[PDB]
Design a protein around this ligand. Structure first.
Ligand SMILES: [Ca+2]
Ligand SMILES: [Ca+2]
Ligand SMILES: [Cl-]
Ligand SMILES: [Cl-]
Ligand SMILES: [Zn+2]
Ligand SMILES: [Zn+2]
Ligand SMILES: [Zn+2]
Ligand SMILES: [Zn+2]
Lengths: 96, 96
């Protein structure tokens, strides 16, 4: 009944919920597990480029500095990953 | 080799590319076809709420007013759809 694009959006909300606490936001250790579980090939390409994405991702995406990642900040992180994959689709090297 | 989350991101880039012109941006008639093809259940829920999402989506998401939707603006639209589905996941009515 749902399209592939709709199930994809629903899958990202289901993913977010695997990592949220009772406040519906993601703490730092949880974010890093989410990245390692769901974006391992993304992370691996950075580490080759000499980049430890995990060292800064929490602090960079915690825009309101409340030491949580909320849904809006989580979407911003997915956007970032999407931008990298789009660049790759055009012959760019991973994690630039 | 790619995770489900990675294939989902790749699927959204593949979707974007179904609708772009030679300049790598999406014109209005194309955006509306993309919505109707990929988010029909989203759109249907709006039309019930008396909302014609298609009447304004192009103009609302064309942030730089160049009459194209570029990748960054397309991600912003997916974010919007994601926000609605997240709200739904918490008992909110579709298209609020
Ligand atoms: Ca925050
Ligand atoms: Ca534009
Ligand atoms: Cl939540
Ligand atoms: Cl493009
Ligand atoms: Zn939630
Ligand atoms: Zn696992
Ligand atoms: Zn492209
Ligand atoms: Zn079709």
């Amino acid at each position: 009944s749902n399209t592939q694009a709709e199930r994809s959006i629903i899958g990202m909300i289901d993913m977010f919920h695997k990592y949220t606490g009772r406040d519906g936001k993601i703490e730092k250790p949880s974010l890093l597990t989410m990245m390692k579980e769901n974006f391992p090939n993304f992370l691996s390409a950075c580490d080759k480029k000499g980049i430890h994405y995990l060292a800064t991702v929490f602090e960079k995406k915690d825009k309101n500095e409340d030491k949580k990642i909320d849904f809006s900040e989580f979407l911003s992180l997915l956007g970032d990953i999407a931008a990298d994959y789009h660049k790759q689709s055009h012959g760019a090297a991973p994690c630039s």
